[PDB]
Amino acid sequence: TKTESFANLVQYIRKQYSLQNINNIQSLLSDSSNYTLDPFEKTMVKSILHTMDSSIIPSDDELLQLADYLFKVEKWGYYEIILLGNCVRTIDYNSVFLLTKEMLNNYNKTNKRIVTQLAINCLILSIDMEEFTNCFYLIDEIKALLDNELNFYEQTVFLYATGYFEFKRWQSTSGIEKMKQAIQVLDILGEDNLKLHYTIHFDKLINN
């Protein structure tokens, strides 16, 4: 089937992202590799690379067509959820929040975790853009998605996102502790190439 190779592609991308191995993700685009991606996956790969290197933006036509195709589908499955969650930083926020709100109104074990990640990404993006009425809703939905589920990775990144939201809105000394506890959880479990991504963010937040 088709949705069996897309999962392997996403897992390969996320494993090369953890090792910080650029130039191996930037080799699926070139016309010599195993994975040949349809123009909706090339856009997702370019959007993922854009987070590691700010000069690999997708074109405006690609994003226009991706948003047009997203606003048309009605059965949101394993494909559209990933395409949207991995392009939160390029698609305009106004159209990201609408789709994330519609996804949380369509209420499996592998799909709850794939919706939790999209919700957390939308929450981080909404904290960046300073939309605070759109953040309480996301926090209230996410803390109900993570209810009695043993997803410690999503729970850790959501702890960090909650600390971020609390430091942004009120500038209080109680979001700092949540961010530092998330960093502690990353440091105890031995995630060395993942603790750095959050330590750099914390350092550029607190120091200005």
Partner: peptide, 8 residues
């Protein structure tokens, strides 16, 4: 960045 790669 601090966003998680959805799907992996």
């Amino acid at each position: 960045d601090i966003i998680i790669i959805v799907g992996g």
